[PDB]
Amino acid sequence: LNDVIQDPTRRNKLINDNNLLKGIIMGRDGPVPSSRELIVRPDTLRAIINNRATIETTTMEAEFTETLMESNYNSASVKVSAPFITANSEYSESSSFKNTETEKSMYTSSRYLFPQGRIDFTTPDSGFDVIKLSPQFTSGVQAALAKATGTEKREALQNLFQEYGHVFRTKVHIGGVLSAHTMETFSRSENETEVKQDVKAGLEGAVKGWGGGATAGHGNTQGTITTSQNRKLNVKYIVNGGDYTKIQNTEEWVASTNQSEHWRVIEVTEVTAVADLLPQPIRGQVKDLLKPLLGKWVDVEKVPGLESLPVSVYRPKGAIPAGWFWLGDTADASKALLVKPTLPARSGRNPALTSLHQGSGMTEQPFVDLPQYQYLSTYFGSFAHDTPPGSTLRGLRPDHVLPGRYEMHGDTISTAVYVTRPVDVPFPEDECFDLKSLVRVKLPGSGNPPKPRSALKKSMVLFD
Amino acid sequence: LNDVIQDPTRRNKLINDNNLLKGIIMGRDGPVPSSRELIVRPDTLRAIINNRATIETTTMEAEFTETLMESNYNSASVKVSAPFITANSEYSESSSFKNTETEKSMYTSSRYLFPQGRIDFTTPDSGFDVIKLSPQFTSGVQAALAKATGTEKREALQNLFQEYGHVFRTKVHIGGVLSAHTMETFSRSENETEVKQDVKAGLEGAVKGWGGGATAGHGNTQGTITTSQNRKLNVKYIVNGGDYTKIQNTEEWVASTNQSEHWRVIEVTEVTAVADLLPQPIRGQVKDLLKPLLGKWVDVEKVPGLESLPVSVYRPKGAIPAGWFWLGDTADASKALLVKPTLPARSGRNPALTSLHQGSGMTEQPFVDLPQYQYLSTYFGSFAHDTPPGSTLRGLRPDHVLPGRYEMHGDTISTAVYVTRPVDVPFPEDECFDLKSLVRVKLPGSGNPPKPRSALKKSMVLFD
Ligand SMILES: [Cl-]
Ligand SMILES: [Cl-]
C-alpha cells in the first residue's frame, strides 16, 4: 500500500530508486537524471491513492520528443520539457521524422498503467509541505550571478543547468507499466483525425493484448502491428516497474507490481522548469540571462526591383551593427528585428543561429548550414553568403520557432506571396513576434528549399 | 493580516462577502454568483501571503469575454470560462468587436493590485483539506441522471448548471484593486506585437498614474487615453475592495485596503468547470450528456460541374437521416460528419445550430439566420434554404468553433481554393476535427459573406 510505504525508511528507498530529488537533464541521450540533488530530502511524500489499472495514449506532433514519449511523459510534461530537448538534440539531415510540404510525422505512445498512486512535489508559491531547493544548488545560482561579465554569468548558469537539470518532475505516477511506442509518417491529403484515431486504436489494442494476458508474453522488444486501416507500424515495447525477471508470464509480472520494492515511475504527469522553482527576484534575473538572443528594433528600407509583387518588400535599413543579424524579408514598413547571440560558440553546443549557403540546384534561395535549423522568409533576390545583405542573414535553432499562419496576397499565383503571422488561437500558451515574414507562393526553378511557415518565440529574445 | 483573518469567525465574513462557496453562472449579464452553495463550508482557508503591490495586464482576442476581463479574470480563468459565456451571450449584428478580413479586435485590461494574499480551493483528485461538493448539488446530479430519457437527463443537467454555475473559482487574490479596461480595433496590416505593446503601455501608464496618487483621483468611471503611437482609447475604470467612500483621495483608499472588512476578490487566478469537480464515473456521464451535438460519420459523393476546380468537392452521400445536419463542402473523399442537436429549442437559449438563407446581394452564398453564428465552408453552387442539399446545411454557435488554418490549392487565383485544417501548434489545449472544409480564394460577385476559417471542437460532439 502507498500509505504503508510512506511511513518508515522504505519511503527513502522509493525516493532513491526513482531519483525523486533530482532534476532531469534534457540532452542528446534523452531525459537523464542529475547526479546532484536539486531539493532537500522531505520528511513525507504527498501521495494520492489510485490502484485502478487504465490504458492512456499520447499523440505528439513535436519533433525531438521521442525519448520523452518513451519515458511515458504525458503531453503537459512533453510541452514543458520540449524547448530543452529540442535545443540539446543531435540534429541530422537523415531523420525519419518528416515534415515536408506533402508529408507529416507524429509520435504515438500507449501505456497500460498498473498504479499504486501519484506523488506530488508542491512547488514554491503554491498552497500546501513545499519544495526547498538544496543549498548546493542555491549557492551555484548565487555564484553564477556573481560573475564579472554578462557572458560569464550566462556560461556559469548554462553549466549549472547541465549539471542540475532543466526540469524537475513535480507529479509522477508510481507502480508498474506496459507501454508501446510508435512513429507514423502520412500524407497531408489524409484526414488527420482518422489517421490519429487509427494509430491510437491499433496501439491501445497491442497494449491491451499484451497486458491482462491475451497475446504471447515478452519484455522490452521491437515489434510490428497492423491497424484496422492497413497501416503497418514499427512498435517499441517498454516495461517499467514490477519484477522484470517475471515478464515472460504477464500475470506473474502484474502480481509483482503490488510489491513496494518493484514500484517505479510509470508516468511523468507534471514537470516544472528548474528556473521556475527559484524565488521571485533571482527567478527573473536567471530567466533573462538564459535567453539565447538579444533583440533590437531598427528602421527598414524597401527592396528595389519588386514592382511585380502585390506588397512592398523590406529589409533592415543598416548600417547593421557589428555582431547583429537579421532574419528575413518582411512586409513590415515600420520596423525590423535584429538579433545577437548571448552565448559563445562551443563544440557540442547547438548555436542559437546558423549561417546560410545558396543551394547547389538551379535555385538562388538560401539553405541552412546546420541541419534542421529553420528560417522565416523566402529570399527576394539572389542569395550569397559572402555579400550583403545575405552575409548577415541567419537561420534559427528549432527550439526558437513555432508554426505560423499565412495571409495570402496577389492577383496571380506567380506574383502571389504569403505574409507570415502568429497563429490566431484565442488562448495561446506561447507568444510569438509578428514579424510579417514574406514567403513566395510559387518559387521559380527546381531544387528550392521547403517553404518556411514559422514565427519566432518572444521568450527567446532579451530587450535592453 | 491574512493569517489573522483566517483564525476566528471573520474568515466566514471573508467567505460570505466574496461568495467563495458559490459557483459562477456565465450568462448574458456577465459572471453572476449562484444563490446556492456549491461546496461545504470549510473549517480553514488555504492562504498564501503576498502584500506586494503590482501592475498586471491581460490581452484577449476572444470575443464575448469583456465581462470576464472587467471582473479581473486572468487569461487562464478566461480560457476555462470562455465556452460558457460564449454559449450564453446575447448575439448581435451591431457589436463593436470586429473580426473581418481587413480588421481585428481585442480587449486589454490592466490592474493595479494592492493584495493581502491568495486563497486556494483544492480540487478533488489533487494533493493537500480538499473540496467537498454540497449534498444539495450532489442530489441534483443524481436526480438529473435518474430521468427516464436522454433528453430529460440533459434538460435537468442544463437547469442544474444554470442554478449552480458553470465554473468555480479555485484560486483568487484578496485585497484591493484599481483597474482599467479597453477594447481596440485595428487593421490586419499593422504589426500585432507593436499594437499590443502600445495599448498595454498606455493602459499600464493610466493605472500607474491613478494608483499611487499622481493623476486626479476618481472612482468607477469612463475615460479616454492616448497611447505613445496616437491611438485614442475608450477606458472603463473599475475599483474592487477597499473603502469606496475614500476613493476620491487615492492614498486614503490605499490605506483602507489593509482593513480586513474591505478585502474583496481582486483577481480570479484559476477557475475550474463545475462538472470537473464531480467524482470519476459521474463526471464522464455528465460531460457526455452536456455535449450539444451528436455525431455520425457517413459516406460522400463528388459534386458535379466542378471540373475547373483544382480539387474534388464533396458532400454527404445521403439519404441524410431525419433530424441530422451537414456542415459544408469538403475535400475529404472518404467520410463526412453529420450532426444532430441534443437539446430541444427553447426561448432564451442559443441553439447549437442555425439554418442559413441566401444573401440579398448579387451573391448565391449562405448567410447565418442567427447573428454571430459561424459556418465552415464556402458553398460550391447556388444556395437555397428550401431545396436539397442546402435545406439540411447548418451553421454553428460560436462556442463550437476555433480558428483553423488554410492550405491553398490551384494554379489560378480564380479557381484557387483553401482546404481548412486544424492549426498545427505542437501542444494544443483544445482539439478540433480535421474536416478538410473547402473555402473559395476569390468568390465571384459582390455582397459575399466573410470567408470562413474555422474548425469544429471535438469536445462538442458525442459519438455512439
Ligand atoms: Cl544545397
Ligand atoms: Cl442578406
Residue numbers in the entry:
A (entry chain A), B (entry chain A): 55 to 182, 184 to 519
Quoted passage from the original study:
To gain further insight into the structural conversions in pore formation, we chose pleurotolysin (Ply), a MACPF protein consisting of two components, PlyA and PlyB, from Pleurotus ostreatus. Previous studies have shown that PlyA binds membranes and is required to recruit the pore-forming MACPF protein PlyB to the membrane surface. PlyA and PlyB together form relatively small and regular pores in liposomes. The membrane attack complex/perforin-like family (MACPF) proteins form the largest superfamily of pore-forming proteins identified to date.
The 2.2 Å structure of PlyB reveals an N-terminal MACPF domain (blue/red/yellow) followed by three small β-rich domains clustered in a globular trefoil-like arrangement (green). The TMH1 cluster of helices (yellow) is located on the inside of PlyB, next to the concave face of the central β-sheet. Together, the central β-sheet and the TMH regions constitute the topologically conserved MACPF/CDC pore-forming fold.
